[PDB]
Amino acid sequence: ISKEYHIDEEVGFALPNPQENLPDFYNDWMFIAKHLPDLIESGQLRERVEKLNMLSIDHLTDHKSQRLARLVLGCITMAYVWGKGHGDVRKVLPRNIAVPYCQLSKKLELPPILVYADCVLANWKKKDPNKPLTYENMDVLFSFRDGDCSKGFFLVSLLVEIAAASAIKVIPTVFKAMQMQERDTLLKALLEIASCLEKALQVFHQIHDHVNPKAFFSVLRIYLSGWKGNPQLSDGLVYEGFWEDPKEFAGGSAGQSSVFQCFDVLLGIQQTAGGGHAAQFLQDMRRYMPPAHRNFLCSLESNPSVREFVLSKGDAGLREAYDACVKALVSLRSYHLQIVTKYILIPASQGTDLMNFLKTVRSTTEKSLL
Numbered sequence: 001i002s003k004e005y006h007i008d009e010e011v012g013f014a015l016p017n018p019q020e021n022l023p024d025f026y027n028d029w030m031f032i033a034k035h036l037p038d039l040i041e042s043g044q045l046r047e048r049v050e051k052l053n054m055l056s057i058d059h060l061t062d063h064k065s066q067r068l069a070r071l072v073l074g075c076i077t078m079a080y081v082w083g084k085g086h087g088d089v090r091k092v093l094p095r096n097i098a099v100p101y102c103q104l105s106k107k108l109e110l111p112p113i114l115v116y117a118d119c120v121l122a123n124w125k126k127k128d129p130n131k132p133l134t135y136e137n138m139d140v141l142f143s144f145r146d147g148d149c150s151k152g153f154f155l156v157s158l159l160v161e162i163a164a165a166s167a168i169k170v171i172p173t174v175f176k177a178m179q180m181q182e183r184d185t186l187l188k189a190l191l192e193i194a195s196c197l198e199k200a201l202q203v204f205h206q207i208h209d210h211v212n213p214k215a216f217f218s219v220l221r222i223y224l225s226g227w228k229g230n231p232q233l234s235d236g237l238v239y240e241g242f243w244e245d246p247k248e249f250a251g252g253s254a255g256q257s258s259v260f261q262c263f264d265v266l267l268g269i270q271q272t273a274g275g276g277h278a279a280q281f282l283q284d285m286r287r288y289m290p291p292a293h294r295n296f297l298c299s300l301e302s303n304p305s306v307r308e309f310v311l312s313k314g315d316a317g318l319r320e321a322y323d324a325c326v327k328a329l330v331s332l333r334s335y336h337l338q339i340v341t342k343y344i345l346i347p348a349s350q351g352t353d354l355m356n357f358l359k360t361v362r363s364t365t366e367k368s369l370l
């Protein structure tokens with residue numbers, strides 16, 4: 001059983017039952033975010049961000065409240081800087097909203113920009129508290145524009161994180177099986193992690209039914225892009241009243257998903273080795289995860305290597321069970337690679353930086369087989 005890594009045995013890395021409402025003191029922030037599709041189109045979003053007061057973060061006591069306040073402020077920032085999403089970029093964030101978002105981001109050890117942990121892990125709720133977690137029974141908390149498939153893009157992303165929750169709980173079982181030298185306990189525990197990663201691929205299939213190719217490329221992808229190496233903000237975003245210099249921060253990508261790196265590290269796949277772009281990007285995106293997940297990924301690399309344990313015993317039965325988890329990963333990297341073609345490459349032709357990246361993390365996964 002995992003410790004104070006804020007990993008839930010039911011939903012995994014996602015926030016378990018996230019809050020929907022801040023205290024009534026923060027009605028100004030909750031109002032702008034809950035009506036984002038209308039204020040962006042009406043042109044008064046950026047006005048209502050300017051006619052704001054500099055509120056205090058101190059009223060955010062419990063954990064679930066600060067995450068939402070990062071979630072509400074993260075969406076406003078992406079909506080403010082990008083506007084309707086056609087070129088009118090605001091290279092300055094106003095102080096009455098820049099310094100409260102930077103205070104809370106420094107609080108949660110997160111960057112002051114919308115990340116995967118905000119719009120996926122803490123951005124959901126159950127329609128019926130008695131009916132189980134499925135797409136038809138769950139809904140998002142915030143969106144960008146009308147018909148952007150942000151419900152489908154985020155809930156399907158979240159749905160696969162819940163399938164991995166049934167595999168992360170097996171990690172302590174594997175690590176103590178190696179310590180106690182119990183082979184059968186390790187063989188089944190490896191088979192179980194593989195099997196849950198097999199079920200997680202079927203959850204990935206749902207993305208076609210709830211997300212549209214060009215509705216994602218044109219509407220949602222524009223607001224999720226950040227300002228690190230982005231040409232529209234050559235130096236980044238100035239946080240007025242917090243940093244005198246413009247600060248470069250990466251946007252949101254699947255690399256910030258903790259299950260992305262969770263099993264690469266466990267199975268001994270040195271995805272962060274070498275000076276490659278994928279190995280550097282996977283290490284840089286750890287700073288964009290919650291602090292509890294930064295240390296959980298850290299604790300796995302500290303624990304003994306599971307790969308060398310199987311490669312040493314000369315046990316073909318263990319070699320086949322371990323190879324099943326690697327094959328389950330390749331099946332996901334090969335499906336994730338397919339989704340990017342239908343959703344980025346072909347829309348972009350009426351783009352390839354994510355393509356060349358995701359081919360390398362899969363290529364490394366195939367080279368791990370025995």
Ligand SMILES: C[C@@H](C(=O)Nc1ccc(Cl)cc1)[C@H]1[C@@H]2C[C@@H](n3cnc4cc(F)c(F)cc43)C[C@@H]21
Pocket residue numbers: 115116119120153154156157160207224252253254257259260329330332333334336
């Ligand atoms: C639906 C897609 C998405 O990119 N969602 C998204 C993007 C940006 C933002 Cl900001 C928020 C959500 C994909 C989901 C599940 C993915 N995944 C998790 N563990 C994986 C292990 C693997 F081997 C693998 F190949 C993919 C794996 C990550 C994203």
